[PDB]
Design a protein around this ligand. Structure first.
Ligand code: SAM
Lengths: 916, 238
């Protein structure tokens, strides 16, 4: 049972005057006979009636108002079109002059965010009728509701002046005018309670309920967006700036003084929507002088918290009023409000941002596949166990911070909740886990140290920062200073900076490499369009900056950031894998990286924004010993090829072209020509060609072989174009020779579907083919689904037993009555009896499914743990149990890591490849 | 069994096998694995770039069904038997400046560039008398080959066989499964089993006889159709 219902019942019962009675155990409500009712109310219609009764009691007893001026349940009869309408008004209180002092509409607290559409259907018609009949003006309209904070009932109300905004246009430009949060006694002008730290009533809300955030989101989509305006970037940017200003408010305003985000309200009545622009602009400078610490005087001077041409201030004041008590920095403290604001803002980004070529977001299913396929959870657990640290993840092209957000929510969930048994219980490990995850109010506290990022777009940089603040991080490490800038330019106030550090590498070519990060995940842009202000990095900092393909620079950056043994999972375009022009980069990776998985992706992945085939590359940086071994083998086989080229070209000129023998040739060449050791002649042809020769070629004469080949032997003879890095040898020949010695297996797979299809209209689910959700929680509580569920049924059983007893008493008291007049109410009692039997019928029906789900729990669960045979959810039967009926709740949408059964690509990733 | 795998375990040494560009990808390595399985017992595997003389891409201007202009073909005229079933339905009414090589001649090899992933790279040979000049659309390639080593119809039959279908289902580069476009680069780099010309003629003869059998079946079919017509006519007349 809910405590607040009992508190309200006790508060209403403690009043001296017994005018209204309620009984939750019997589920009945009774009122005094003074007010006429057109129907016999016998069942609880909802919380609305209780709130109305509480308001009536508050008006009569606490505010000392005369009851004769209060009117409730007023009946109206109107003929609308071909039908009849009977609207009702909740509370009417008129003064001595007849004007309505209180025009109060009562609605349930849990129904406020979804009943707004009916408000227009209940208020405007009555005003129009009043104007048609008496041509008078109503003074103030009051909308009242109750809220529960720290077991205390607080009042949040909206007061609208009808005379101030006589027209609908003026009311819309007013932006949901609310004169005061609370009423005032002694005929005083309405006054709002300050929102200031220090007083629990004055303080903001920290217990954020899960449901009203969805109502706020849909109201913003239906009002701010205009209903017909969707996917507009500037409105989203204005909302982002407003939220950033609010964040700065909680950051700087601190305790002992009221916040400046709320309407200061020096006067009793709320002022015009104007005279707030200067406030919000100065506040928006305090932000970016405190958080971002920008050093652009022109950008500060241009202000532009909003744009006045496309963002009218009425929507601004609506947004400000809607977000007064929703403290974002402190709302994450509560368990209930832990993830509410993050989901709210990710929904804001999802619905409202227009994305297209150049600027579009990586879908979540691909991001989670990338993060899990790197075994990032296991890497983090091993790092915590061995070195008492977490992996140092960076995303050098983080647009909206999707990769970083998913990495945060993955590491926290895996280390703290899911795979917490893997980590050891040593005292040092325990204390490190204490300063990392334990406080449980800000579990994403480690991110401030172990999560970096780089974005070139300032707007998306601010969006990423505010998103990742609302998800729990401080978001200090996200940089808006371009991905490819040198490591010296990345500067920020906080002292621990792993991106500043750099040092030249002898193997790389004397160029500077960072070598500090563990994991590098990114979605590289198709075309970097590197800025012309700093073009020294194109030549000096990067090996292949002079080439036409400037996006292939990103791969080189991934070599500099990673540590010796680091992991790299990126979505490279398919053109990198199959195009001759990109060959230089493909020889680059094999030089320094251990390719481990190439997962192809369907072209429906990025629809509708772009239709190009992309592939996933998973690689691991190679240590100094392996790359020096590669260098020495390359040098050896390149020298051997260099000798073979000159020898075989000398062989051609004489033995085929016919040019006389000369003594200026190699001694082995000249003697093999003179004494005719044709076996060595054939052997050199075979070794130089390697492939391109068959078993027929060995017997056939060398001269005809050379004539037939010509083109192929010339192609093999020609050396490479990149030079310097490779060393004047043939890449194909020497690469084959070296790769014969250093062979390792690469895993390749293709996905046909990715679990979704994003047409221009909307998403439609499809087979996943990448990973499979768990669909069955690993922790199911019997008492959570049992006791609370049976409380309702046994309370109803007790209520129906009491009803049966009273019905029997009425039956007897009518048995000693005369039948003719009895018949009508006897039939009414029969209707009551059939209602009771049918209601207990559906209670018995739901008790049957209760019994069957209890049986399923007993069959599949042993001490709230999934058994080993049911641990890997290959059993479609249990899955179908959870995703059907009433078991929709308590589902687990996490990605399932089977580790022993291979069905989908992620399982083969996590089993086949080894990261070491 | 091999084609329907969706998972390939590729070694590093396997990358540089007749590659010359160090291409590593799921599609390319799957194609190489299938080719290795095909060409296991078969020998004399040879590239098509050595025995190719020229390749010319056709082009087709704006046209409407009919139009009383010079006729043009359609994508349905290509056949698996390797014979171009000439039956144009549309024509172009306006004239161009040059049309010398845009007509179809007898004994030519036509390659399908853009079509479905199944029917892409489909090849045909023009064997009937062309008579009137007809324009062949852009989704075609005229292929002139070394006649001494490889026969014109044998290449078409190979391309229409699974030998070419498996290669072109992975080599094709298209934005959707409905249209994938091949180019001349893979035609240059394609590897073929090229037995002695006697074997090619023997294969062609077997295909022709097994197609003539089916021709007997449909000639029986129009015999039945004519029987239906005769029954209707005799019932109606009297
Ligand atoms: C790939 S999108 C989305 C990235 C990430 N998956 C996300 O959801 O936030 C990132 C965008 O930022 C841009 N971008 C990021 N880093 C850049 C850089 N260093 N130089 C130029 N553009 C960059 C790219 O143009 C790209 O369109």
């Amino acid at each position: 049972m809910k405590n607040w219902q009992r508190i309200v019942e006790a508060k209403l019962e403690q009043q001296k005057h017994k005018v209204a009675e309620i009984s939750l155990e019997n589920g009945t409500v009774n009122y005094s006979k003074k007010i006429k009712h057109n129907r016999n109310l016998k069942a609880l219609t909802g919380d609305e009636e209780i709130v109305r009764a509480f308001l009536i009691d508050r008006l009569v007893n606490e505010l000392d108002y005369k009851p004769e001026y209060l009117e409730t349940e007023k009946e109206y009869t109107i003929k609308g079109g071909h039908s009849k309408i009977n609207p009702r008004v909740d509370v009417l209180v008129k003064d001595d002059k007849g004007n309505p002092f209180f025009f109060i509409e009562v609605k349930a607290p849990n129904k406020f965010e979804e009943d707004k559409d009916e408000i227009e259907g209940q208020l405007f018609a009555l005003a129009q009728a009043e104007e048609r009949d008496f041509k008078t003006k109503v003074k103030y309209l009051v909308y009242y509701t109750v809220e529960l904070i720290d077991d205390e009932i607080v009042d949040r109300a909206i007061i609208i002046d009808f005379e101030k905004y006589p027209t609908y246009t003026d009311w819309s430009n007013g932006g949901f005018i609310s004169t005061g949060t609370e009423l005032t006694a002694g005929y005083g002008e309405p006054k709002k309670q300050p929102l200031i730290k220090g007083h629990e009533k004055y303080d903001l809300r920290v217990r954020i309920d899960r449901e009203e955030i969805e109502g706020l989101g849909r109201n913003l989509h239906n009002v701010l967006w205009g209903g017909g305006g969707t996917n507009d970037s500037e409105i989203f940017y204005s909302l982002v700036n407003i939220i950033l200003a609010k964040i700065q408010d909680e950051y700087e305003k601190e305790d002992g003084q009221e916040y400046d985000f709320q309407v200061y309200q020096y006067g009793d009545n709320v002022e015009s929507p104007q005279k707030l622009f200067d406030r919000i602009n100065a506040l928006y400078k305090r932000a970016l002088r405190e958080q971002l610490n920008v050093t652009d005087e022109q950008k500060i001077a241009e202000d532009n918290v909003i744009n006045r041409n496309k963002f009218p201030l009425n929507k601004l004041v609506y947004t400000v009023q809607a977000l007064e008590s929703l403290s974002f920095l402190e709302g994450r403290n509560s368990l209930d409000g832990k993830d509410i604001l993050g989901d709210f803002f990710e929904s804001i980004i999802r619905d409202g941002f227009k994305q297209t070529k150049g600027q579009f977001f990586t879908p979540t299913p691909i991001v989670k596949f990338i993060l899990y396929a790197l075994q990032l959870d296991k890497l983090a657990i091993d790092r915590l166990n061995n070195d008492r640290e977490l992996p140092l993840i960076i995303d050098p092209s983080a647009g909206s911070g999707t990769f970083l957000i998913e990495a945060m929510k993955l590491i926290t969930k895996e280390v703290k909740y899911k795979q917490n048994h893997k980590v050891k219980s040593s005292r040092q490990i325990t204390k490190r886990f204490e300063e990392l995850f334990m406080p449980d109010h800000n579990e994403n506290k480690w991110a401030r140290e172990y999560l970096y990022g780089c974005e070139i777009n300032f707007d998306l940089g601010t969006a990423s920062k505010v998103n990742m603040i609302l998800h729990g991080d401080g978001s200090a490490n996200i940089f808006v200073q371009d991905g490819l800038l040198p490591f010296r330019f990345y500067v920020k106030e906080t002292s621990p900076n792993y991106l500043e550090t750099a040092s030249p590498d002898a193997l790389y070519g004397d160029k500077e490499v960072n070598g500090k990060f563990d994991v590098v995940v990114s979605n590289p842009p198709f075309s970097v369009d590197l800025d012309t202000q700093t073009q020294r990095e194109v030549r000096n900092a990067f090996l292949f900056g002079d080439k036409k393909n400037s996006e292939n620079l990103f791969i080189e950056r991934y070599y500099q950031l990673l540590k010796e043994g680091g992991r790299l999972g990126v979505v490279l375009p398919e053109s990198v894998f199959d195009t001759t022009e990109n060959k230089y980069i493909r020889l680059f990776i094999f030089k320094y990286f251990k390719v481990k998985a190439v997962v192809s992706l369907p072209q429906v992945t990025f629809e509708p924004f772009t239709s190009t085939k992309t592939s996933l590359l998973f690689a691991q940086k190679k240590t100094k010993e392996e790359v020096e071994q590669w260098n020495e083998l390359w040098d050896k086989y390149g020298k051997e090829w260099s000798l073979l080229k000159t020898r075989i070209n000398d062989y051609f000129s004489y033995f085929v072209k016919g040019r006389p023998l000369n003594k200026k040739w190699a001694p082995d060449v000249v003697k093999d020509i003179q004494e005719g050791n044709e076996d060595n002649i054939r052997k050199n042809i075979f070794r130089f060609l390697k492939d391109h020769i068959k078993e027929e070629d060995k017997n056939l004469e060398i001269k005809d072989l050379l004539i037939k080949y010509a083109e192929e032997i010339s192609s093999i003879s020609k050396h490479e174009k990149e030079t310097d890095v490779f060393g004047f040898y043939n890449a194909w020949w020497v690469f084959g020779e070296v790769a014969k010695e250093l062979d390792y297996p690469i895993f390749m797979a293709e996905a046909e579907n990715v679990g979704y299809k994003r047409t221009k209209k909307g998403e439609k689910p499809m087979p996943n083919d990448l990973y499979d959700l768990e669909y069955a929680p690993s922790t199911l509580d019997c008492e959570k689904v049992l006791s609370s569920f049976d409380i309702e049924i046994n309370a109803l059983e007790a209520s129906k037993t009491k009803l049966s007893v009273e019905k029997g008493l009425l039956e007897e008291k009518l048995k000693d009555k005369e039948d003719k007049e009895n018949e009508k109410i006897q039939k009414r009692l029969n209707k009551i009896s059939e209602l009771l039997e049918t209601i207990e019928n559906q209670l018995d029906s739901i008790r049957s499914k209760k019994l069957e789900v209890e049986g399923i729990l007993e069959k599949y669960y042993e001490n709230n743990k999934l058994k080993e045979e049911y641990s890997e959810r290959d059993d479609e039967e249990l899955i179908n149990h959870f995703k059907h009926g009433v078991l929709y709740q308590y589902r687990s949408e996490d990605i399932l890591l089977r580790n022993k059964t291979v069905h989908k690509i992620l399982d083969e990733i996590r089993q086949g490849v080894i990261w070491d | 069994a091999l084609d329907s795998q969706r998972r390939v375990d590729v070694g590093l040494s396997s990358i540089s096998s007749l590659n010359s560009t160090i291409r590593y990808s799921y599609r390319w390595n799957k194609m190489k694995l299938i080719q290795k399985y095909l060409y296991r017992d078969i020998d004399c595997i040879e590239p098509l770039g050595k025995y190719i003389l020229s390749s010319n891409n056709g082009w087709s201007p704006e046209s409407v069904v009919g139009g009383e202009g010079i006729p043009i073909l359609g994508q349905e005229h290509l056949e698996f038997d390797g014979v171009l079933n000439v039956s144009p339905t549309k024509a172009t009414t306006k004239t161009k400046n040059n049309m010398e090589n845009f007509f179809i001649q007898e004994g030519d090899l036509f390659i399908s560039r853009g079509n479905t992933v199944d029917l892409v790279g489909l090849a045909c040979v023009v064997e009937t008398e062309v008579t009137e000049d007809i324009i062949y659309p852009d989704l075609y390639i005229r292929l002139k080959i070394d006649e001494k080593v490889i026969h014109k119809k044998y290449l078409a039959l190979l391309f229409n066989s699974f030998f070419g279908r498996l290669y072109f289902k992975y080599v094709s580069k298209g934005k959707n499964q409905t249209m994938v476009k091949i180019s001349s680069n893979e035609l240059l780099n394609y590897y073929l089993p090229i037995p002695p010309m006697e074997e090619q003629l023997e294969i062609v003869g077997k295909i022709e006889e097994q197609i003539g059998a089916q021709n007997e079946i449909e000639k029986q079919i129009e015999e039945k159709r004519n029987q239906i017509r005769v029954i209707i006519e005799e019932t109606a007349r009297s």
